């Protein structure tokens, strides 16, 4: 790449990428039990694993919403088309995830019980 950006701001920019992406998927997938992301960033490929609880709900009917989430991520970050792929994976022992249980308790409280 002839833009040739330095390593110091490179790792910082990757961190800001994961921060904005984490908060974006937090506001998107909170109904699904979103617990986090892990970006397996290959050269020429980029897998981006979402870890949540209701993977069918985060996937959608025929996978529509995960498609449009891939389109959103690619069009926002200016990625090459088809370079990134989102992947829904269910967390093991979802009770022991403090994030998913906090979101569950959040949706219970706005459900309205004591």
């Amino acid at each position: 790449m002839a833009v040739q950006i330095s390593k110091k701001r490179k790792f910082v920019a990757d961190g800001i990428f994961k921060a904005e992406l984490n908060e974006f998927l937090t506001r998107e997938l909170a109904e699904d039990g979103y617990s986090g992301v892990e970006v397996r960033v290959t050269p020429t490929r980029t897998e981006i694993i979402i870890l949540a609880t209701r993977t069918q709900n985060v996937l959608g009917e025929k996978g529509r919403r995960i498609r449009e989430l891939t389109a959103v991520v690619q069009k926002r970050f200016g990625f090459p088309e088809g370079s990134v792929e989102l992947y829904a994976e269910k967390v093991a022992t979802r009770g022991l995830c403090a994030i998913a249980q906090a979101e569950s308790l959040r949706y219970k409280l706005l459900g309205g019980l004591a």
Partner: protein, 96 residues
């Protein structure tokens, strides 16, 4: 918004050829990056899809400075009936 017919058609055709559209929250953008040939400033983009949000056609979320919009199904049939399209052709988020 006094938007041109051509700019509104540009907005609707990009929104219908890919089911999502994003925008940095900035009135003071000169010209929109994701559709940048027929002019359409980001002001026009934001307020057009605000009009699309307000009568329940598109869905909106916001992460740090960026609107993210997802076109719903009744928005699909509206935007097809506006753009005068056959019922076979769909956005890329629908077909495989």
């Amino acid at each position: 918004m006094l938007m041109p017919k051509k700019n509104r058609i540009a907005i609707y055709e990009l929104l219908f050829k890919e089911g999502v559209m994003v925008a940095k929250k900035d009135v003071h953008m000169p010209k929109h990056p994701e559709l940048a040939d027929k002019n359409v400033p980001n002001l026009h983009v934001m307020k057009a899809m605000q009009s699309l949000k307000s009568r329940g056609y598109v869905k909106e979320q916001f992460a740090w400075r960026h609107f993210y919009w997802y076109l719903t199904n009744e928005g699909i049939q509206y935007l097809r009936d506006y753009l005068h399209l056959p019922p076979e052709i769909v956005p890329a988020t629908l077909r495989r």
